[PDB]
């Protein structure tokens, strides 16, 4: 069992999830390929955290790169940056620049 | 007596009537003042005579 978290990386959680959900529960050495080939906003952030997760083996409790598979992973909402966008007739509409917490938990099998 | 068993002269004590709190004690929404009368409004009384 090994774990990693991104802790408020600037990306919308829905957009994160839409690309995140497909790698769930499939062998990491090929999931990384799937995700670095699929073009999406959050793909680079997600492979960075996944690579940190698998790389938690060197100055860490030992695992092997083969026979390694994502165990379970998900997306959590983080603190949001409020912003007021100007809009016609002095309405002053509001917008949410969301943030998200990414998290990977990889295990052996 | 001692203070730790103080008991008043029974019949010489009554709790206040907290009008306008819930329905279980009556006098709820209306606070026991009817519906929308002049008497039902704050300072809505009239000259006594």
């Amino acid at each position: 069992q090994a774990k990693a978290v991104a802790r408020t990386v600037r990306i919308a959680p829905r957009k994160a999830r839409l690309v995140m959900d497909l790698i769930r529960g499939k062998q990491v050495g090929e999931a990384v390929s799937i995700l670095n080939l699929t073009p999406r906003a959050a793909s680079p952030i997600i492979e960075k955290v996944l690579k940190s997760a698998i790389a938690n083996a060197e100055h860490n409790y030992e695992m092997d790169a083969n026979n390694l598979v994502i165990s379970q992973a998900f997306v959590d909402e983080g603190p949001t940056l409020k912003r007021f966008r100007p809009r016609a007739m002095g309405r002053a509409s509001q917008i949410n620049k969301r943030t998200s917490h990414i998290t990977i938990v990889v295990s052996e099998k | 007596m001692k203070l730790h068993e103080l008991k008043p002269s029974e019949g010489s004590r009554k709790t206040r009537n907290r009008v306008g709190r819930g329905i279980g004690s009556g006098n709820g929404k209306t606070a026991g003042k009817g519906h929308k009368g002049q008497n039902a409004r704050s300072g809505g009384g009239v000259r006594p005579g």
């Binding site: - | 007596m1 001692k2 203070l3 103080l6 008991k7 008043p8 002269s9 010489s12």
Partner: protein, 205 residues
């Protein structure tokens, strides 16, 4: 009204007759209750105030036009339901004291004293002389008398000398013959009374 007499070192002499009109009276439960309640309420100083709507440093302007807006029709900013505050029917500086009839107060003090007498917790200590301000002298006196719990001591003339010794140890009070009340009596569960003060209070009542 024939309670025994005690000396400084616990030696007991011939018992003393007490005025039945003051100490043999049947205590009045209700009158004692109201007498307790009386100064128990009057003691509080009751200083409290909270800023009513008028005096909240602000308000003034109508926050928005009466109609033609999607918000509730409102008044000034400092109003009760607003976050800005302004309480409604809050506390106010007021006194929690009144007065009772002379007969009632006399009956109350007589009743409590007689209650103590019948409960046999009164201890008459003639001539509570003391040569020094030191506390442990009077602590030894109380130990000799077997006075364990709270107590009250009244001695009229030795108040000047004995008050300093008594006041710290450990929650007992020294009062003068004129300072008797209902709480100061009841709360202390043990009355030390010097004979001069016996007849002085006897004359007063």
């Amino acid at each position: 009204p024939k309670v025994a007499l005690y000396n400084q070192n616990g030696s007991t002499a011939g018992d003393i007759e007490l005025n039945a009109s003051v100490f043999g009276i049947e205590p009045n439960e209700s009158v004692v209750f109201d007498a307790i309640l009386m100064q128990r309420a009057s003691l509080r100083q009751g200083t409290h105030k909270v800023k009513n709507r008028s005096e909240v440093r602000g308000g003034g302007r109508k926050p928005w036009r009466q109609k033609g807006t999607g918000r509730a029709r409102q008044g000034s900013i400092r109003s009760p339901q607003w976050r800005g505050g302004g309480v409604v029917f809050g506390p106010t500086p007021r006194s929690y004291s009144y007065k009772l009839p002379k007969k009632v107060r006399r009956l109350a003090i007589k009743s409590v004293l007689s209650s103590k007498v019948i409960d046999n917790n009164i201890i008459v200590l003639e001539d509570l002389t003391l040569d020094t301000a030191k506390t442990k002298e009077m602590a030894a006196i109380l130990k000799g008398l077997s006075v364990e719990k709270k107590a009250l001591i009244v001695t009229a003339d030795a108040n000047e000398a004995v008050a300093l010794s008594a006041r710290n140890i450990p929650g007992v009070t020294v009062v003068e013959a004129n300072g008797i009340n209902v709480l100061d009596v009841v709360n202390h569960e043990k009355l030390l009374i010097t004979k001069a003060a016996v007849e002085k209070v006897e004359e007063v009542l």
